[PDB]
Design a protein around this ligand. Structure first.
Ligand SMILES: Nc1ncnc2c1ncn2[C@@H]1O[C@H](COP(=O)(O)OP(=O)(O)O)[C@@H](O)[C@H]1O
Length: 346
C-alpha cells in the first residue's frame, strides 16, 4: 500500500521505493519474491482518456508480442479481476538503472561503448522492423541500460505498422515524435510510415554519442531542417526530384546554398568507420539511406556482427490495429483482454 499514492502490487512484490513519474502514473522498484530479484513497476491509470487508452493498448500489444534481448519485456501485469474494478494497471519490467539520456548528461563514452550500444540498438531495431513495426520515437531517453550496459529499447507509444504506400503527405504536416530525432522527410512530405525514419533517429543517437550533445537541436519544425541542411549541405537536384510536393520542393529551393561540413571536423576524435556509418544513416534521401541489416554489416560493427545471433520476429504485425476508431469503453475492454494471460490460472 501507498508511496505518496496507492501502489498495490499484490502478494508477489515487496518493499517499494519511489523512482519517478511517468506519463500515466508513478514508478517504483520493488522486490519480486518469485524470482528473488529487484524489478521496475509502472502504475498506469489511462481509462479516463481515449488517447491514453489507445497508447496503452498499443504498447501492451506490441511488448507482449515482442520477445528480444534488446527490447524491454513485460514480465507481469497486475490489475483487478473484473473490468468494473479495474481502474489502474501495473506493468512489471526488468529493473534498468539508467538510460542513454541520463548517461550522456554526465558521462563520456569510450569508442568501445559507442560501438556496443550502437550494435544493441540496431540488433533490437532489426527485430522490430522484421515485425513490420516502426518505433517512430527513438531517442536516448527511450534506450534503457542496466548496470552492466545491456541496452533495451522502450516506449512504443507512437509505434505503427509500416505502410510505405501511404507515406506521402503535404508540406509541414503535424508530427508527434520528439523533434531533434525527426528525419527531414517528416517536415517535407512524409507521414513517417517507412522504416527509414527509424534509421535517421539512430543516426542522430550515434552523433550524440560521439560528442555528448544533440547533433540537430532545432527549436521548431523548420529550424530542425535548417539545422540538418547546415551540416549535410543543400540537397542535390537528384534528391529534390524525389520530392514531388510543390510546396516542399519550393521551400528547399528558396533556401541559400549550403555546403556539407565534413563529419571529421565536427567529431575530430571519432573512429573513421563510425563516421562512415554515420554518414550513411544521416543521408537526406530516405531511399538512399542505409537499412538496419546493412548497418549491422558495416565494418564499424565487425566485432559484434553475427546474423545468426540477430533474430527476426516469428510473428509480424500485418495490422495496423485500427485503434483510432474505438471509444474509451471498447479500449478499456481490450486492455482487460490483452492483460488476461497474467491472471492466476485461466
Ligand atoms: N524499467 C525501468 N527500470 C528503472 N527505471 C525506470 C524503468 N522505466 C521507467 N523508469 C523510470 O521512471 C521514470 C518514468 O518513466 P516513463 O513512464 O517512461 O516516463 P517518461 O517516458 O515521461 O520519462 C523514467 O524517467 C525512468 O527514469
Amino acid at each position: 500500500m501507498v508511496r505518496g499514492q496507492v501502489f498495490d502490487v499484490g502478494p508477489r512484490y515487496t518493499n517499494l521505493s519511489y523512482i519517478g513519474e511517468g506519463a500515466y502514473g508513478m514508478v517504483c522498484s520493488a522486490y519480486d519474491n518469485l524470482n528473488k530479484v529487484r524489478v521496475a513497476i509502472k502504475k498506469i491509470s489511462p481509462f479516463e482518456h481515449q488517447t491514453y487508452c489507445q497508447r496503452t493498448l498499443r504498447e501492451i500489444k506490441i511488448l507482449l508480442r515482442f520477445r528480444h534481448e534488446n527490447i524491454i519485456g513485460i514480465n507481469d501485469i497486475i490489475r483487478a479481476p473484473t473490468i468494473e474494478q479495474m481502474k489502474d494497471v501495473y506493468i512489471v519490467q526488468d529493473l534498468m538503472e539508467t538510460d542513454l539520456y541520463k548517461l550522456l548528461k554526465t558521462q563520456h563514452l569510450s569508442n568501445d561503448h559507442i560501438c556496443y550500444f550502437l550494435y544493441q540498438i540496431l540488433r533490437g531495431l532489426k527485430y522490430i522492423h522484421s515485425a513490420n513495426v516502426l518505433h517512430r520515437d527513438l531517442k536516448p531517453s527511450n534506450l534503457l541500460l542496466n548496470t552492466t550496459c545491456d541496452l533495451k529499447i522502450c516506449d512504443f507509444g507512437l509505434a505503427r505498422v509500416a505502410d510505405p504506400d501511404h507515406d506521402h503527405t503535404g508540406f509541414l504536416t503535424e508530427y508527434v515524435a520528439t523533434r531533434w530525432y525527426r528525419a527531414p522527410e517528416i517536415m517535407l512530405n512524409s507521414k513517417g510510415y517507412t522504416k527509414s525514419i527509424d534509421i535517421w533517429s539512430v543516426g542522430c543517437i550515434l552523433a550524440e554519442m560521439l560528442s555528448n550533445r544533440p547533433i540537430f537541436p532545432g527549436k521548431h519544425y523548420l529550424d530542425q531542417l535548417n539545422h540538418i541542411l547546415g551540416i549535410l549541405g543543400s540537397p542535390s537536384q537528384e534528391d529534390l526530384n524525389c520530392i514531388i510536393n510543390l510546396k516542399a520542393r519550393n521551400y528547399l529551393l528558396s533556401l541559400p546554398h549550403k555546403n556539407k561540413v565534413p563529419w571529421n571536423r565536427l567529431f575530430p576524435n571519432a573512429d573513421s568507420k563510425a563516421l562512415d556509418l554515420l554518414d550513411k544513416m544521416l543521408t537526406f534521401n530516405p531511399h538512399k539511406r542505409i537499412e538496419v541489416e546493412q548497418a549491422l554489416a558495416h565494418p564499424y560493427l565487425e566485432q559484434y556482427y553475427d546474423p545468426s545471433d540477430e533474430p527476426i520476429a516469428e510473428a509480424p504485425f500485418k495490422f495496423d490495429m485500427e485503434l483510432d476508431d474505438l471509444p474509451k469503453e471498447k479500449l478499456k475492454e481490450l486492455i482487460f483482454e490483452e492483460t488476461a494471460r497474467f491472471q492466476p490460472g485461466y
